Design an enzyme around this catalytic site. Structure first.
Site, PDB file in Angstrom:
ATOM      1  N   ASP A 122      35.867  43.575  30.153  1.00 27.22           N
ATOM      2  CA  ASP A 122      35.948  44.979  30.531  1.00 27.22           C
ATOM      3  C   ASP A 122      34.839  45.780  29.869  1.00 27.22           C
ATOM      4  OD1 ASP A 122      36.935  47.246  31.767  1.00 27.22           O
ATOM      5  OD2 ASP A 122      38.390  47.658  30.170  1.00 27.22           O
ATOM      6  N   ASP A 125      31.672  47.614  31.657  1.00 25.89           N
ATOM      7  CA  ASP A 125      31.350  49.023  31.434  1.00 25.89           C
ATOM      8  C   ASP A 125      29.868  49.206  31.143  1.00 25.89           C
ATOM      9  OD1 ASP A 125      34.034  49.455  31.791  1.00 25.89           O
ATOM     10  OD2 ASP A 125      34.404  50.276  29.785  1.00 25.89           O
ATOM     11  N   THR A 140      44.358  39.650  27.711  1.00 28.67           N
ATOM     12  CA  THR A 140      43.693  38.674  26.866  1.00 28.67           C
ATOM     13  C   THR A 140      42.534  39.335  26.135  1.00 28.67           C
ATOM     14  OG1 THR A 140      42.300  37.931  28.705  1.00 28.67           O
ATOM     15  CG2 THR A 140      44.356  36.725  28.311  1.00 28.67           C
ATOM     16  N   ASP A 173      42.701  47.631  35.890  1.00 27.77           N
ATOM     17  CA  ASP A 173      42.917  46.285  35.372  1.00 27.77           C
ATOM     18  C   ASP A 173      43.811  46.290  34.138  1.00 27.77           C
ATOM     19  OD1 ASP A 173      41.023  47.537  33.748  1.00 27.77           O
ATOM     20  OD2 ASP A 173      39.839  45.719  33.439  1.00 27.77           O
ATOM     21  N   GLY A 174      43.783  47.373  33.359  1.00 30.39           N
ATOM     22  CA  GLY A 174      44.652  47.465  32.197  1.00 30.39           C
ATOM     23  C   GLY A 174      46.119  47.533  32.573  1.00 30.39           C
ATOM     24  N   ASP A 220      41.221  40.317  35.446  1.00 30.44           N
ATOM     25  CA  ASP A 220      39.777  40.105  35.373  1.00 30.44           C
ATOM     26  C   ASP A 220      39.130  40.214  36.745  1.00 30.44           C
ATOM     27  OD1 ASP A 220      40.606  37.375  33.173  1.00 30.44           O
ATOM     28  OD2 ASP A 220      40.243  39.468  32.637  1.00 30.44           O
ATOM     29  N   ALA A 221      39.836  39.778  37.792  1.00 32.02           N
ATOM     30  CA  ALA A 221      39.299  39.890  39.140  1.00 32.02           C
ATOM     31  C   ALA A 221      39.077  41.342  39.517  1.00 32.02           C
ATOM     32  CB  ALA A 221      40.233  39.208  40.137  1.00 32.02           C
ATOM     33  N   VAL A 222      40.028  42.210  39.187  1.00 32.76           N
ATOM     34  CA  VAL A 222      39.859  43.620  39.506  1.00 32.76           C
ATOM     35  C   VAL A 222      38.765  44.238  38.644  1.00 32.76           C
ATOM     36  CG1 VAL A 222      40.990  45.862  39.373  1.00 32.76           C
ATOM     37  CG2 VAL A 222      42.120  43.926  40.508  1.00 32.76           C
ATOM     38  N   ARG A 281      49.032  44.874  31.566  1.00 31.65           N
ATOM     39  CA  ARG A 281      50.302  45.261  30.962  1.00 31.65           C
ATOM     40  C   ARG A 281      51.485  44.756  31.777  1.00 31.65           C
TER      41      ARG A 281
HETATM   42  N1  LIG Z   1      40.417  41.940  32.480  1.00 29.63           N
HETATM   43  C1  LIG Z   1      41.173  42.609  31.629  1.00 29.63           C
HETATM   44  C2  LIG Z   1      42.248  41.991  30.943  1.00 29.63           C
HETATM   45  C3  LIG Z   1      42.956  42.752  30.096  1.00 29.63           C
HETATM   46  N2  LIG Z   1      42.677  44.072  29.904  1.00 29.63           N
HETATM   47  C4  LIG Z   1      43.500  44.856  28.944  1.00 29.63           C
HETATM   48  O1  LIG Z   1      43.556  46.224  29.291  1.00 29.63           O
HETATM   49  C5  LIG Z   1      43.052  47.025  28.195  1.00 29.63           C
HETATM   50  C6  LIG Z   1      42.335  48.255  28.694  1.00 29.63           C
HETATM   51  O2  LIG Z   1      42.977  48.842  29.841  1.00 29.63           O
HETATM   52  P1  LIG Z   1      42.067  49.731  30.813  1.00 29.63           P
HETATM   53  O3  LIG Z   1      41.118  48.793  31.500  1.00 29.63           O
HETATM   54  O4  LIG Z   1      42.997  50.415  31.770  1.00 29.63           O
HETATM   55  O5  LIG Z   1      41.346  50.685  29.907  1.00 29.63           O
HETATM   56  C7  LIG Z   1      42.164  46.045  27.420  1.00 29.63           C
HETATM   57  O6  LIG Z   1      41.851  46.504  26.110  1.00 29.63           O
HETATM   58  C8  LIG Z   1      42.988  44.759  27.508  1.00 29.63           C
HETATM   59  O7  LIG Z   1      44.099  44.707  26.644  1.00 29.63           O
HETATM   60  C9  LIG Z   1      41.613  44.655  30.599  1.00 29.63           C
HETATM   61  O8  LIG Z   1      41.331  45.845  30.422  1.00 29.63           O
HETATM   62  N3  LIG Z   1      40.890  43.897  31.449  1.00 29.63           N
HETATM   63 NA    NA Z   2      35.126  47.895  33.360  1.00 26.90          NA
END
Ligand SMILES: Nc1ccn([C@@H]2O[C@H](COP(=O)(O)O)[C@@H](O)[C@H]2O)c(=O)n1
Ligand code: NA
Ligand SMILES: CCCCCCCC/C=C/CCCCCCCC(=O)OC[C@H](O)CO
Ligand SMILES: CCCCCCCC/C=C\CCCCCCCC(=O)OC[C@H](O)CO
Ligand SMILES: CCCCCCCC/C=C\CCCCCCCC(=O)OC[C@H](O)CO
Ligand SMILES: CCCCCCCCCCCCCCCCCC
Ligand SMILES: CCCCCCCCCCCCCCCCCC
Ligand SMILES: CCCCCCCCCCCCCCCCCC
Ligand SMILES: O=P([O-])([O-])O[C@H]1[C@@H](O)[C@H](O)[C@@H](O)[C@H](O)[C@@H]1O
Ligand code: NA
Ligand code: NA
Ligand code: NA
EC number: 2.7.8.-
Lengths: 336, 336
Positions: free
Chosen positions: B215, B219, B208, B197-198, B157-159, B202
């Site tokens: 996210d 956007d 979460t 952040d994804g 979430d920070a990123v 992972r």
């Molecule tokens: N802050 C967060 C925490 C989790 N995620 C996870 O990463 C997925 C999307 O990855 P991308 O941001 O790389 O598209 C989200 O649907 C969720 O599962 C996120 O994107 N941002």
């Molecule tokens: Na975003």
């Protein structure tokens, strides 16, 4: 000098939440300015208005504004009648025949009253409903005839959504850029209420649809965007005010995102509601600001920036608050 | 009632990809139906099965199917012991001798588990192997970036918030000044940064739902900021009003396009699709602005064509998604 003749029932003796339904109906009627008379055989005393309640009922609305000549109903059941004193000139002793003669001799309207008819096998619902009521009525009373009429003349709920949204965007994008902020605010408010009529219309069709709800919400977003876009056009190219367009852009974007947070959170099975500024308060603030800034004869222009700036700040805060809701929802932080 | 007794080690405190090895082994063992107890001296509580792990270990297997009496091993190294509750009747206080007596009293089988025993001079190899177990240009540049950002204490979430803030800053600082090419570059870079952040999530064994909502909302804020900075420049720098109607259409319709899908999914319907989605939206507008402000070969018409195309393509998209909502299963069914 209004008299309320309530027919006696054994169920009135029943106690609900510490008071007898007979006492409960007596207090509600008295709060509405009625002198209450429980009767078995009706004896009409001279008065200006007669509220005659024949079926045992628990009234759930605090302020009972009765006027004209009406037939009180609830969930389809005819609870009572609101007659004038002229009923005394027709009442002959037979209450059914007298009521039928008075109905044929006058023009009456239905009056949906927030109440439930009591029986030996429905007191749990009455208790639940009284608790809900204690923790809108006129909104329903003014909305239901309108929705009925619109359905009767052939309009569907989604059609009314499209009509209200189209008319509101037209008013916002035609009147606001011209500087006609007061008539634009009035037209937009009128057709925003018109768009909101579709929910009552669908409730009258024994149920709406999921597409209809999605369409109503997306149209809310289009309408808000149009309001703020017309106001932005005026402020930028008519008043030539750059700080105020900063406020207007913030209001536009943050309103879109405030609504989107709740939508997306619910899509994930979480909550995202709440906040200081929701769509009704947003629209009221911005439209009252515009209207006061362009009010005829005694316009106060600083109402537009104030409303815009206040809203902007209140929107940013709101955007955070809703995020907090999303943060505090069950399962929001699970590593799934 | 299965208990997993893990000997406490200082190394368990180190974090590998955002999580401590203690929490990581705890979650892994709990997934296998064990209540985890970290110990220094063993005090046996009554249980069904006992999993004793004495050496510091990183377990790399997701599903641990333990039954009977087994000895967990990996590459010749003894990882743990899986005994029955009867071990409670053999444990005398000295864990090594008790384990040896229990082994002498039973016939056990090896269970090859994918795990690695940890030491101060092999945590890099352990992190690499954990990354292999949990997991284009993404592998060589994105994954090292996520590992690094997690190492210094940043959360997914920070990123998300930092990348969105940096992109909004670039859009609102560079675009209004007329620096369309540097703005396009900065926005593109920090959109990729936000998308890191994804990978970070992972690598922490899961994201979460709140992170996903955040996210998406970020956007939307980023789209709003891009189009708002471009609108500012076009309105007060280029003084081009037709292009401002096109840019306003792009702003509003991008917000509403995303809201439609979110709201449809909130209602249990679909709302995706369309010719122009967020990646194509960004590419078109960012390429048009950049070509218009490109050094030596700036071509002014690229910004208006990109915008108008985009505008026309967005409205259509907004309709297409609505049609999707109309044609989803259960969309037009009545809700009693
Ligand atoms: N802050 C967060 C925490 C989790 N995620 C996870 O990463 C997925 C999307 O990855 P991308 O941001 O790389 O598209 C989200 O649907 C969720 O599962 C996120 O994107 N941002
Ligand atoms: Na975003
Ligand atoms: C919570 C997140 C909200 C996100 C959405 C917020 C929208 C804010 C809009 C800002 C406009 C940018 C104003 C930048 C000031 C421009 C200064 C400048 O250099 O202007 C020169 C002019 O264009 C030629 O004369
Ligand atoms: C599908 C639904 C998508 C809705 C998108 C809304 C876009 C608002 C664009 C606002 C542009 C307003 C232009 C008004 C104008 O050009 O007016 C000039 C003249 O000064 C007037 O008197
Ligand atoms: C759709 C195509 C729009 C072309 C607009 C254009 O050519 O504008 C040039 C310059 O920005 C203004 O003279
Ligand atoms: C200017 C904004 C108006 C947006 C209209 C959206 C179109 C929705 C189409 C669905 C209609 C369903 C049934 C209509 C009666
Ligand atoms: C933080 C709020 C900033 C308010 C600035 C007010 C400017 C007035 C000019 C329209
Ligand atoms: C706590 C919620 C934060 C979500 C991200 C918002 C990022 C927006 C920051 C805007 C910064 C403006 C810079 C302008 C110069
Ligand atoms: O029902 P819905 O339209 O999806 O949700 C909306 C309403 O619940 C609320 O009154 C409004 O102010 C918000 O903008 C929100 O978005
Ligand atoms: Na509606
Ligand atoms: Na419908
Ligand atoms: Na609507």
């Amino acid at each position: 000098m209004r008299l309320a003749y309530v027919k006696n029932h054994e169920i009135y003796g029943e106690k609900l939440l510490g008071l007898t339904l007979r006492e409960r109906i007596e207090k509600t009627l008295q709060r509405a300015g009625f002198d209450v008379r429980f009767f078995d055989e009706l004896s009409l005393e001279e008065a200006e208005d007669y509220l005659i309640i024949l079926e045992p009922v628990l009234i759930l609305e605090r302020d009972l504004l009765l006027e004209g000549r009406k037939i009180l109903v609830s969930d389809g059941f005819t609870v009572g009648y609101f007659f004038g004193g002229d009923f005394r000139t027709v009442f002959d002793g037979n209450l059914q025949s007298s009521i039928e003669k008075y109905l044929s001799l006058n023009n009456l309207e239905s009056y949906e009253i927030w109440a439930i008819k009591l029986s030996n096998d429905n007191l749990k619902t009455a208790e639940k409903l009284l608790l809900s009521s204690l923790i809108r009525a006129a909104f329903a009373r003014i909305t239901l005839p309108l929705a009925r009429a619109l359905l009767r003349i052939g309009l569907t709920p989604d059609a009314v959504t499209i009509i209200g949204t189209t008319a509101s965007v037209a008013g916002a994008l035609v009147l606001f850029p011209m500087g006609k902020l007061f008539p634009g605010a009035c037209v937009v408010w009128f057709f925003v209420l018109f768009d909101m009529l579709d929910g009552a219309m669908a409730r009258l069709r024994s149920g709406g649809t999921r597409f209809g709800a999605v369409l109503d919400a997306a149209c809310d977003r289009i309408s808000d965007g149009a309001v703020f876009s017309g106001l932005l056009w005026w402020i930028a190219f008519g008043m030539r005010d750059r700080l105020l367009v900063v406020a207007t852009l913030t209001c536009l974007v943050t309103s879109q995102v405030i609504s989107y947070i709740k939508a997306r959170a619910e899509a994930s099975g979480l909550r995202g509601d709440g906040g200081i500024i929701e769509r009704p308060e947003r629209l009221i603030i911005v439209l009252v600001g515009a209207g006061v800034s362009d009010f005829p004869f005694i316009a106060w222009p600083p109402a537009l920036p104030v409303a815009m700036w206040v809203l902007a700040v209140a929107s940013v805060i709101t955007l955070g608050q809703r995020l907090h809701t999303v943060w505090t929802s069950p399962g929001a932080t699970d590593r799934i």
